[PDB]
């Protein structure tokens, strides 16, 4: 196989904007004997986020466009995309749970993929249908809810992986769980201590969550 030739490829692909080839090469490198160097880790993080992101965006728009006869095609078009969505998330939610989380014996990485898991189940949670919805909205809670606690006993708020979490896990409430009180709370909180107390990354995350309470 040659592990670092796939890394060598995922670099090139990204530097070529065609992001599927990119997630493929990484999907590969992780379905190897994991413990993805942060580099690879992000590459993977970036690539997969681009595809599933690409789908979300398209899904959103098309839902509103749908949600008439034009509508059934809107529907048909939606499902087509939802699928593509689901298969991407089903795909990354694998590597995470089956290679990543268990092949990252370090706190940093621990809290990370636990966001990712949550991030993805969350996407799967928007796009849902019946009780499967509840099944996946819950699977996301626990996953987000497991590193918040992990970040919490292993490293600081002024660190972007935790701050970030707070943001996203906070948002898990508005868009998803319907607990604005908890979202806002979590955001005021994780923002709060952030201030208490390298440079940029934190700062950035730090604003966005505020920017967010400005909404809620």
């Amino acid at each position: 196989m040659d592990k670092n030739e796939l890394v060598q490829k995922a670099k090139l692909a990204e530097q070529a904007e065609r992001y599927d080839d990119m997630a493929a090469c990484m999907k590969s490198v992780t379905e190897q004997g994991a413990e993805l160097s942060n580099e690879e880790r992000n590459l993977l993080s970036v690539a997969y986020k681009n595809v599933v992101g690409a789908r979300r965006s398209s899904w959103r728009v098309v839902s509103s466009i749908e949600q008439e006869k034009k509508q059934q095609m809107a529907r048909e078009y939606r499902e087509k995309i939802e699928t593509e969505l689901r298969d991407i998330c089903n795909d990354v939610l694998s590597l995470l749970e089956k290679f990543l989380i268990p092949n990252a014996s370090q706190a940093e990485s621990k809290v990370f993929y636990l966001k990712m898991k949550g991030d993805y189940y969350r996407y799967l949670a928007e796009v849902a249908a019946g009780d499967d919805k509840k099944g996946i909205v819950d699977q996301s809670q626990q996953a987000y809810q497991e590193a918040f606690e992990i970040s919490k006993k292993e490293m600081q708020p002024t660190h972007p992986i935790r701050l970030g979490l707070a943001l996203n896990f906070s948002v898990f409430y508005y868009e998803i769980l319907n607990s604005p009180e908890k979202a806002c709370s979590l955001a005021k909180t994780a923002f709060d201590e952030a201030i208490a107390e390298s440079y940029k990354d934190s700062t950035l995350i730090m604003q966005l969550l505020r920017d967010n309470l400005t909404l809620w």
């Binding site: 992000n42 986020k49 972007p160 992986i161 996203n168 995350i205």
Partner: peptide, 5 residues
């Protein structure tokens, strides 16, 4: 770095 929205 991490993920953001």
């Amino acid at each position: 770095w991490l993920d953001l929205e």
